[PDB]
Design a protein around this ligand. Structure first.
Ligand SMILES: [Cl-]
Ligand SMILES: [Cl-]
Ligand SMILES: [Cl-]
Lengths: 52, 51, 50, 601, 457, 8
C-alpha cells in the first residue's frame, strides 16, 4: 500500500471508453413519397417584407 | 420552361440593370436560371427514348 | 504452475497456502479447499481431480 | 462562372462579333476547360458542340477559328495549368488551416480566406474529376494527382474549424453588424434624397435589425435567422434595378456593394453550415464512385499520403447534400451508398494498420529469437577449445532506410489518420474509426498466436512453449506501443484474446493453444513414453528421449523441462493447466478401469 | 555485488543468477530449514530496514552516469545503443573479485555457459531489460526513479540548457524571413546559411547543447518505456488472477443456447476457485480480512484506468517558466512571424545544423545522439504550445517545400541541396511522429478580436 | 471505479 501510494502521485485517469463501430439512429429516416404540385410564387410572401 | 420564358420576357420589358459587382443576387439568379434552363434542355435531348 | 502463480499473484497464493495448511475434518469440505489449492499448483495429500 | 460565360455568350452570340470584351471573356473560358458539367457526371464537350452550331450560321467564320484555337490551347495547356493550381492550394490550405488552428480568433477577421480557400480547392477537384474520366491521356501521368487526398484533408480541417469555432465567427460579426455596418448604412440611407415607402421600409428594417444584435445573444447561443433580411436585399435589388425606378441602383453602386458586404456578415452569423455546403460540398464523388475508391487505394498505398486517408470517409458525410425535395426516390439509395462507402474506407484503413503491425511483430519476433540461448553455442565452443544483437539498431544515417523504418513510418502515418477524429456522423449513423482497428487487432492477434503454435496433426509437430511465449511477448510489446498512436485500450485487447486461449475453445468455438498443447502432450509425448522411447528423469525434472530404435521427431526434454512447463503455465494459466490435468486424469481412469478387471479376474 | 560493478545491461544476468539462487534455495529447503528466500534476498539487497534496495539504487546510479548521457534511442527497433567514441563518457567502477563457482552458477562450465547466454544482452537496452527493471524495482522503485528523473530534467532545463538557450537566442538573427519561392531553393539554402552562420559555427552546440537535450530525451523515453513494461507486467498478473477472482472469458454459443444461461453455468463450474467467497465460508476473521485486502491489491492495477506519462509531461512544462522560452508579446498582437524570439525558432536553427550532410566517413547526429535529441526538442516545443507555428515557420521545412517545387539541385556552401532536403524530409517525418505522440498523451478559452470600430462610437 | 490502493 505504501509503494502504490508513492506511484499513485505520478498518475491520472486515462479516459478511455468502448463503443460500437457503427451506431444507427434511434429513428431511421422515413421514405417520403413524391407528389406533384404546381409552381407557387407565394411561398416566400411571409419571409421578410413580402408582396401579395 | 414556360414559367422561365415568361419571366425572361418580363425582364426584357423591365429593362433590368445587371452588374455582378452591384446587384449580385439579382444577376447571379438571372444567370443561374438561364444556365439551368439550358442544361435542362440539353440533358433532355440526351434521353433518346423520350419519344 | 505453482512457481508461476507465486510470482504473478503472491497475495492470492499467500492466502491459499495459509488456508490449506491450517485446516482441521470433514471430507467434502476438504476437497473444496484442495480443489482451490491444486488450481494454484499447491501439492495435496489427496488429489481432488484424481 | 465558366458555364455562365460559355453557354451565355452562345445564347446571345450576336454580341461575340460586336463586342471585344464578350469575345475575350468567352475565349478565356474556352481555353480553361475541354468539357463542362451539365449536371453531376453528365458532361458537355464544349468546342465540338460549339463549332457545329457556328458552322451552320454565316457571319461567324471568325468565331469558328477562335473555337479551334481555344480547343488546342485547352487540350494542351489547361491540364498542366490546373495541376499547378492543386500544388499551390495544397501548400496554401495546409498553412492556412494550421495558422488558424493556432489562433482560432483569426476566424473572425479572416473568415473570407476560409471560404475563398474552400471554393478554390473545391473547383480544382471537380475540374480534375470530370476531365480525368472524359479526356484521353497524352502521357501516363495525365490527370492523375496522387496527392489529392492531402488537398481534400485540409479542406476538412477548415470545415472542422468553422464547426468548432462557429461562436467565434458569430460573435465577431454581430459586433461588426451592430457597430460599423449599422453606422455606415444608416449614414448612407439618410443621405438619399429620394426613395418610395417600400424601399424606405426595407432599408430602415436593415438598420433596426442590425442595431438590435449583441454579443450577449451569441453567448446565449441563440439561433439567428436573417433569411428575411437577405431576401429583402434581393427584393430591393429588383425594385431598384428596373428602368425608371425612383431609386436607381446604377446611380448608387456603393449602396449595392456595401449591402453585399453586410449580407456576407449576416451569413457569418446564421449561415456557417450552409456556407460550408456552398463553398466546399463534394457530394459529386457519389457519382464518381469508381474514381472515389481508386483515389482511396492510391492514398493508402502511399505512406506519405495515407496520413490523409481519413478524408475519404469524411467526404461520405457530404453525399446527402446532392439531394433535392423534388426527387425523394433517389435519396435513400444515395444514403445507403454513403454508409457502405464510409464503412469500407474505415475497414480498409484498419486492415492496413493491422497488416503493418503484423509485419512489425514478425520483425520483432525475429529479434527476440536472436536472443535465445541456442545461438550462443558457437561462442561456447570457440572458448572451450581455443555478430551481436543490437547491431541492427546502430544507425549511421537516416537516409539508409531499413524494412522496419518503412513499416514504422507507414504505421504512424496511417494511425494519425485513424486517430484524427473520435467519430463521424454519416446520414445520422455514427462511425467510430478506432473500433475498426481494435476489432481487427483482436482478431489478428488470436490468429497469430494459434498460427505461431506451428501445430500439425499429421506430423505431430508443435512449437516449444518457451519459443511460443517468446514470440507472444514480442507481439504484446508491439501492440502495447499502439497506444502511442491511437486512443485505444490495448489492455482490453490483451484480456479478450489471451483469456480465451486458456479455454478448450475460444468464443468462436475454435481450438486454442490450451486444447492444442493438451492434445499433443497426451497423444504424442506421453504416448511415446508408453511405447518405451521416453523416460521421466527426476534428476533433470523432465522427460528425456531414450536411446532406442525409434522414429521420434522431437526431444522430450525441450518440451517438458522446468523452463518449458513454466512457459506453458504462463500461456495456459490456472484455467488451461487445470484443463490439462483433467485430460490426464481421464487416461488414468481408463487404466484403473482395466486394472480392476485384472483384480476381478 | 556483481551487478553494482557492471552497467545497466547486466541486470538481465542478475535476474537469471537470482533465479538460480531461488532454485538452489528450493532444492535445499526439502531437507533443511532456511530463512524464506524473500527474506534472504531483501537482507542482501539491504531492503529490510530501508525503502530502496541496492538494485534499485544502482539502477538509478547507472541511469544518471551511463544510460542518459551515453545511449541513443532507435524508434524503429525500440532499442537503445551506445554513442560514438568521442561522446562516450567513461566512469570507472570498482571491480568485483570473483568467488568460487558454487557462489555463482555452480561450476566453471556453467559460469561460461550462462555468461555467454547473457552476453546477447550487453550491446543494447530494450524491452527485455525494461521488463527485468520493472520486476526488480516494483511500484516503489519505479516511482522513486521517475521522481528522480524529473529532478534531473528540471536540473538540466533550468540549468545548463536554459543558460545555453538564453545565450544562443542572442546569437540568433533578430529577424529572419522565409524568402519567396521565386528566389529558388539554391538561393534559399544560401540565405539560411548566412543568417544562421553563428549557430552553425557555435563550438559547443553538439558537445553541450545536443548532449544535454539527448539526456532529457532519454529520460522521457525511459519513463514512457518503463510504464509500457509495467502495463504488460500488470496485465499478465491479472490474467492469472482471473480464475481465482471469478473472471470468465466469452464462451461460444451454439443454437438453442443463451450466454446468459451459459455464462452462469460456467460460473458454477469455477465456483470452487472463487477465493474470497471460499475463505468467507471457512476462514477465520483474520484470514478473511487478509483475503479481502490481498484480493483488492490483486485486482487493482495501474493498467485498469491510470497512466503516468501524462503527469510526467505536465510537471515538466512547469519547469519552463523562464520568459526566454516564449519570448515577448508579438507586435501584431497575434503571433511572431519573422522574429526569432521563441524557442521553436532556435530549434529550427538547430535543425538546420543537424540536417546538413556530413562527410562519408563522419558520424551523423543520429549516430551520436539517437532519437532522444529530437524527443527533447519536440517535447519543449509541444509543452510551450509552439508546435503549430514551428510547422509553419521552420526554415528547413520551407527549403524542402520550395525545392520540391523547382526541383533544383546544386551545392551551396558544400551542401548538396538534394541530400540536404532528403535529410530534412526524414527529420520531418520523425518530428511529426514525436509531436503527434506527445500531443496524444497531452490530450478552452479562445482569444477573440474586435472588428473595426467606427471612430464615431 | 476509483482505485483506493493507489491513494485514489
Ligand atoms: Cl517463474
Ligand atoms: Cl494532371
Ligand atoms: Cl485474416
Amino acid at each position: 500500500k505504501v509503494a502504490r501510494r508513492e506511484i499513485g502521485i505520478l498518475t491520472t485517469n486515462k479516459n478511455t471508453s468502448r463503443t460500437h463501430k457503427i451506431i444507427a439512429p434511434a429513428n431511421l429516416e422515413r421514405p417520403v413519397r413524391y407528389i406533384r404540385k404546381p409552381i407557387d410564387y407565394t411561398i416566400l410572401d411571409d419571409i421578410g417584407h413580402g408582396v401579395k | 420552361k414556360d414559367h422561365v420564358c415568361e419571366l425572361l420576357n418580363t425582364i426584357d420589358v423591365c429593362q433590368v440593370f445587371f452588374d455582378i459587382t452591384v446587384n449580385f443576387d439579382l444577376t447571379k439568379n438571372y444567370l443561374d436560371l438561364i444556365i439551368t434552363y439550358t442544361t435542362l434542355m440539353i440533358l433532355l435531348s440526351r434521353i433518346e427514348e423520350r419519344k | 504452475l505453482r512457481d508461476v502463480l507465486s510470482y504473478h499473484i503472491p497475495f492470492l497464493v499467500s492466502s491459499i497456502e495459509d488456508f490449506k495448511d491450517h485446516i482441521p475434518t470433514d471430507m467434502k469440505v476438504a476437497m473444496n479447499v484442495y480443489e482451490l489449492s491444486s488450481a494454484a499448483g499447491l501439492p495435496c495429500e489427496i488429489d481432488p481431480a484424481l | 462562372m465558366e458555364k455562365w460565360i460559355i453557354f451565355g455568350f452562345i445564347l446571345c452570340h450576336g454580341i461575340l462579333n460586336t463586342d471585344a470584351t464578350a469575345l475575350n471573356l468567352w475565349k478565356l473560358a474556352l481555353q480553361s476547360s475541354s468539357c463542362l458539367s451539365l449536371f453531376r457526371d453528365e458532361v458537355f464537350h464544349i468546342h465540338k458542340a460549339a463549332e457545329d452550331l457556328f458552322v451552320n450560321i454565316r457571319g461567324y467564320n471568325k468565331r469558328i477559328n477562335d473555337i479551334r484555337e481555344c480547343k488546342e490551347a485547352a487540350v494542351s495547356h489547361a491540364g498542366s495549368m490546373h495541376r499547378e493550381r492543386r500544388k499551390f492550394l495544397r501548400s496554401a490550405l495546409k498553412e492556412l488551416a494550421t495558422v488558424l488552428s493556432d489562433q482560432p480568433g483569426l476566424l473572425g477577421p479572416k473568415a473570407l480566406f476560409v471560404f475563398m480557400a474552400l471554393s478554390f480547392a473545391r473547383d480544382e477537384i471537380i475540374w480534375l474529376l470530370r476531365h480525368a474520366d472524359n479526356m484521353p491521356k497524352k502521357s501516363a501521368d495525365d490527370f492523375i494527382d496522387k496527392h489529392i487526398a492531402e488537398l481534400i484533408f485540409y479542406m476538412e480541417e477548415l470545415r472542422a474549424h468553422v464547426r468548432k469555432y462557429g461562436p467565434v465567427m458569430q460573435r465577431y460579426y454581430v459586433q461588426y453588424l451592430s457597430g460599423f455596418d449599422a453606422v455606415v448604412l444608416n449614414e448612407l440611407v439618410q443621405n438619399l434624397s429620394v426613395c418610395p415607402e417600400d424601399e424606405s421600409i426595407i432599408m430602415s428594417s436593415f438598420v433596426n435589425t442590425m442595431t438590435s444584435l449583441s454579443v450577449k445573444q451569441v453567448e446565449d447561443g441563440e439561433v439567428f435567422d436573417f433569411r428575411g433580411m437577405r431576401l429583402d436585399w434581393f427584393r430591393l435589388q429588383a425594385y431598384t434595378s428596373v428602368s425608371k425606378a425612383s431609386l436607381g441602383l446604377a446611380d448608387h453602386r456603393e449602396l449595392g456593394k456595401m449591402m453585399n458586404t453586410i449580407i456576407f456578415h449576416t451569413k457569418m452569423v446564421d449561415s456557417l453550415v450552409e456556407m460550408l455546403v456552398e463553398t466546399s460540398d463534394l457530394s459529386i464523388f457519389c457519382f464518381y464512385s469508381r474514381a472515389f475508391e481508386k483515389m482511396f487505394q492510391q492514398c493508402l498505398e502511399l505512406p506519405s499520403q495515407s496520413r490523409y486517408s481519413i478524408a475519404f470517409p469524411l467526404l461520405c458525410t457530404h453525399f446527402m447534400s446532392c439531394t433535392h425535395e423534388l426527387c425523394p426516390e433517389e435519396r435513400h439509395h444515395i444514403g445507403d451508398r454513403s454508409l457502405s462507402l464510409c464503412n469500407m474506407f474505415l475497414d480498409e484503413m484498419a486492415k492496413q494498420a493491422r497488416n503493418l503491425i503484423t509485419d512489425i511483430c514478425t520483425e520483432q519476433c525475429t529479434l527476440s529469437d536472436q536472443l535465445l540461448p541456442k545461438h550462443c553455442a558457437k561462442t561456447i565452443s570457440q572458448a572451450v577449445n581455443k555478430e551481436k544483437p543490437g547491431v541492427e539498431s546502430m544507425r549511421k544515417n537516416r537516409l539508409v532506410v531499413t524494412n522496419l523504418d518503412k513499416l514504422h513510418t507507414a504505421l504512424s502515418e496511417l494511425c494519425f489518420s485513424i486517430n484524427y477524429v473520435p467519430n463521424m456522423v454519416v446520414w445520422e449513423h455514427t462511425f467510430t474509426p478506432r473500433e475498426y482497428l481494435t476489432s481487427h487487432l483482436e482478431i489478428r492477434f488470436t490468429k497469430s498466436i494459434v498460427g505461431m503454435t506451428m501445430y500439425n496433426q499429421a506430423t505431430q509437430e508443435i512449437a516449444k512453449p518457451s519459443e511460443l511465449l517468446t514470440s507472444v511477448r514480442a507481439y504484446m510489446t508491439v501492440l502495447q506501443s499502439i497506444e502511442n498512436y491511437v486512443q485505444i485500450d490495448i489492455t482490453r485487447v490483451f484480456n479478450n484474446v489471451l483469456l480465451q486461449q486458456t479455454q478448450h475453445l475460444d468464443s468462436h468455438g475454435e481450438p486454442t493453444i490450451t486444447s492444442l498443447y493438451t492434445n499433443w502432450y497426451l497423444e504424442t509425448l506421453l504416448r511415446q513414453v508408453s511405447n518405451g522411447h521416453i523416460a521421466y528423469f527426476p534428476a533433470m525434472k523432465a522427460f528425456v528421449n531414450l536411446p532406442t530404435e525409434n522414429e521420434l521427431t522431437f526431444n522430450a526434454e525441450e518440451y517438458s523441462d522446468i523452463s518449458e512447463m513454466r512457459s506453458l503455465s504462463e500461456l495456459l494459466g490456472p484455467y488451461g493447466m487445470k484443463f490439462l490435468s483433467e485430460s490426464l486424469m481421464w487416461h488414468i481412469s481408463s487404466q484403473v478401469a482395466e486394472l480392476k478387471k485384472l483384480v476381478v479376474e | 555485488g556483481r551487478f553494482e560493478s557492471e552497467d545497466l545491461t547486466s541486470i538481465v544476468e542478475l535476474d537469471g543468477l537470482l533465479e538460480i539462487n531461488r532454485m538452489t534455495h528450493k532444492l535445499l529447503s526439502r531437507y533443511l530449514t532456511l530463512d524464506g528466500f524473500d527474506a534472504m534476498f531483501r537482507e542482501a539487497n539491504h531492503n529490510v530496514s530501508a525503502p530502496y534496495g541496492r538494485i534499485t539504487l544502482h539502477v538509478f546510479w547507472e541511469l544518471n552516469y551511463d544510460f542518459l548521457p551515453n545511449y541513443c534511442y532507435n524508434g524503429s527497433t525500440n532499442r537503445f545503443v551506445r554513442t560514438v567514441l568521442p561522446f562516450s563518457q567513461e566512469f570507472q567502477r570498482d571491480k568485483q573479485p570473483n568467488a568460487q563457482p558454487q557462489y555463482l552458477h555452480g561450476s566453471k562450465a556453467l559460469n561460461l555457459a550462462y555468461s555467454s547466454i547473457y552476453g546477447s544482452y550487453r550491446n543494447f537496452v530494450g524491452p527485455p531489460h525494461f521488463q527485468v527493471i520493472c520486476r526488480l524495482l516494483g511500484y516503489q522503485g519505479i516511482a522513486v526513479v521517475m521522481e528522480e528523473l524529473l529532478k534531473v530534467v528540471k536540473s538540466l532545463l533550468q540549468g545548463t540548457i536554459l543558460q545555453y538557450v538564453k545565450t544562443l537566442m542572442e546569437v540568433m538573427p533578430k529577424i529572419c524571413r522565409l524568402p519567396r519561392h521565386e528566389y529558388g531553393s539554391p538561393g534559399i539554402l544560401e540565405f539560411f546559411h548566412h543568417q544562421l552562420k553563428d549557430i552553425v559555427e557555435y563550438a559547443e552546440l553538439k558537445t553541450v547543447c545536443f548532449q544535454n537535450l539527448r539526456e532529457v530525451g532519454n529520460a522521457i523515453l525511459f519513463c514512457l518505456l518503463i510504464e509500457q513494461s509495467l502495463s504488460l507486467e500488470e496485465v499478465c498478473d491479472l490474467l492469472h488472477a482471473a480464475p481465482f477472482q471469478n473472471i470468465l472469458p466469452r464462451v461460444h454459443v451454439k443454437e438453442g443456447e443463451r450466454l446468459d444461461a451459459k455464462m452462469k453455468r460456467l460460473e458454477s463450474k469455477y465456483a470452487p476457485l472463487h477465493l474470497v467467497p471460499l475463505i468467507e465460508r471457512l476462514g477465520t476473521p483474520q484470514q478473511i480480512a487478509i483475503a479481502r485486502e490481498g484480493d483488492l491489491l490483486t485486482k487493482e492495477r495501474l493498467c485498469c484506468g491510470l497512466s503516468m506519462f501524462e503527469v510526467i509531461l505536465t510537471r515538466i512544462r512547469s519547469f519552463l517558466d523562464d520568459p526566454i522560452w516564449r519570448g515577448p508579446l508579438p507586435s501584431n498582437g497575434v503571433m511572431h512571424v519573422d522574429e526569432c524570439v521563441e524557442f521553436h525558432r532556435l530549434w529550427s536553427a538547430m535543425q538546420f545544423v543537424y540536417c546538413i550532410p556530413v562527410g562519408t566517413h563522419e558520424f551523423t547526429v543520429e549516430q551520436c545522439f539517437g532519437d532522444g535529441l529530437h524527443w527533447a526538442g519536440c517535447m519543449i516545443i509541444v509543452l510551450l504550445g509552439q508546435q503549430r507555428r514551428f510547422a509553419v515557420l521552420d526554415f528547413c521545412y520551407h527549403l524542402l517545400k520550395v525545392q520540391k517545387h523547382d526541383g533544383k539541385d546544386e551545392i551551396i556552401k558544400n551542401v548538396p541541396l538534394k541530400k540536404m532536403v532528403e535529410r530534412i524530409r526524414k527529420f520531418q517525418i520523425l518530428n511529426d511522429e514525436i509531436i503527434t505522440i506527445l500531443d496524444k498523451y497531452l490530450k478552452e478559452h479562445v482569444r477573440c478580436f474586435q472588428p473595426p470600430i467606427h471612430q464615431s462610437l | 471505479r476509483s482505485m483506493s490502493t493507489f491513494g485514489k
